[PDB]
């Protein structure tokens with residue numbers, strides 16, 4: 139149908155919306171920063187059709203400890219006002235904390251195997267997401283947002299991110315040249331990216347899109363990983379390395395700024411970041427990754 | 430899957446244009462030179478094997494414009510891709526013999542000629558919509574709908590392609606919304622109040638997927654027919670209704686005035702790095 143009449147400030151053609159950052163990729167995908175969108179228009183457009191957003195999160199082994207804060211903050215900041223379906227992948231269904239949900243929001247616990255090596259726990263997320271795209275997501279949600287659990291929402295994360303396929307700029311590399319990117323550099327690996335290629339370094343902790351595009355991405359990344367495993371190689375940054383190979387050759391239709399994936403302890407709060415939306419929580423890496 | 434390509438890395442902390450808005454508040458790209466790498470876009474579109482339709486009306490004396498329109502379209506419009514020109518005319522035998530490059534074809538659609546130039550212009554909406562059903566949905570993937578009294582002077586390519594696009598009218602791109610020449614009479618279906626409006630889109634250049642173009646043209650024609658019943662005709666005819674439609678159904682790309690210009694009236698301002706599609710005297 140049509141949008142209703144709305145009153146908002148006129149977009150000014152001869153005034154850039156940001157003077158300090160790139161707001162569109164060379165393949166004409168928006169790069170999402172505060173200031174580039176009017177959320178009122180986007181919300182109204184989004185309500186033109188009934189649309190449900192799925193959010194996947196893995197809480198395997200000791201990582202169940204992150205769930206309470208993750209969920210409680212998502213309730214405050216994630217797609218508020220819209221239909222949300224949480225999917226918590228865990229080997230401890232009984233360990234999922236009871237979190238009160240707003241109306242139109244629901245949580246499903248998906249029981250899965252717990253791999254021994256943390257590398258495998260992280261990497262197998264691609265296989266598990268892909269499997270469950272078939273089993274459940276295709277029929278239950280229209281978009282999937284796939285994130286790390288060891289995080290909290292601190293500000294708005296809404297429909298501005300939704301698009302057929304998106305990746306997120308990794309906070310450690312947004313200002314870096316491509317040669318400094320930690321892509322897989324061994325040609326023997328499926329994730330290989332040469333020194334003279336690369337658009338951005340995307341973070342493995344935050345990607346998404348339509349269910350079909352996420353199914354494609356995750357299935358492809360899983361297959362590439364299995365080929366490596368057969369060839370006796372494991373990519374330098376695991377699922378993140380394959381994600382980067384995938385997004386290099388299949389360009390995302392939006393790219394999220396590091397507002398959406400940040401660590402304030404390591405990086406502070408630069409002027410270039412007007413909002414800090416989704417951020418790392420403190421953790422002891424050696425301890426939580428092993429029994 | 431794209432092949433390996435060697436191009437300059439996009440710079441996250443360097444705006445691609447510092448002088449213009451390159452994305453709308455609804456996250457639709459505004460297409461200016463410097464915003465796109467045409468090599469990446471061409472690769473993306475060639476992998477889809479896309480056919481682009483181009484509609485143009487050459488009714489009565491406007492057949493005179495066809496030769497230059499088609500010759501220059503051959504040099505600048507979607508070069509490298511499949512193109513299907515549709516010439517709507519009341520004089521099939523008056524269409525010039527223009528040789529076309531490979532993968533490019535032209536069909537002549539015989540339609541009626543209205544006496545008033547306002548009606549010729551306005552009835553384009555009805556005729557495009559009708560032919561979406563008759564021809565276009567089966568024959569092309571995108572439709573680009575333009576004025577004939579024009580010539581291509583520089584690249585007009587797949588960067589414009591999207592489900593729905595309008596083009597910034599060259600006379601108003603730097604104006605405030607109160608100064609836009611929207612229909613202002615509440616009696617007309619094209620009415621837009623002074624406190625509404627994003628841009629003033631030009632009637633001479635719009636398009637999108639056949640599905641979206643079918644919806645837009647049908648809607649604009651219906652609106653015009655309601656107005657006619659109410660003894661009113663919009664101030665800028667089809668353009669007024671185009672603007673009403675694009676206000677309430679936001680385009681997924683907006684084309685800069687590089688794509689619709691008149692150098693005689695407006696010169697060549699620094700903000701325009703290229704003049705792509707321009708008025709003929």
Ligand SMILES: O=c1ccn([C@@H]2O[C@H](COP(=O)(O)OP(=O)(O)O[C@H]3O[C@H](COCc4ccccc4[N+](=O)O)[C@H](O)[C@H](O)[C@H]3O)[C@@H](O)[C@H]2O)c(=O)[nH]1
Nearest residue numbers: 486487488491546549550576577578600632633668691694
């Ligand atoms: O006997 C016919 C009749 C029509 N057609 C067909 O109908 C089409 C439209 O008719 P026209 O081209 O006659 O309509 P235009 O006056 O060109 O009108 C065009 O430009 C105007 C603005 O001027 C530009 C402008 C204005 C102010 C400031 C700056 C400007 N600037 O650009 O710099 C408005 O924006 C109109 O909406 C737009 O269509 C023709 O191209 C033929 O295809 C026939 O085939 N046979």
Ligand SMILES: O=c1ccn([C@@H]2O[C@H](COP(=O)(O)OP(=O)(O)O)[C@@H](O)[C@H]2O)c(=O)[nH]1
Nearest residue numbers: 196197198199201256259260286287288427
């Ligand atoms: O033992 C583990 C290891 C990892 N994960 C999941 O895998 C994600 C990525 O792992 P981690 O955060 O430890 O890696 P990082 O990218 O932060 O270095 C985590 O957020 C969890 O969702 C898990 O559930 N249990």
Ligand SMILES: [Mn+2]
Nearest residue numbers: 286287288343
């Ligand atoms: Mn993490």
Ligand SMILES: [Mn+2]
Nearest residue numbers: 576577578633
């Ligand atoms: Mn004209």
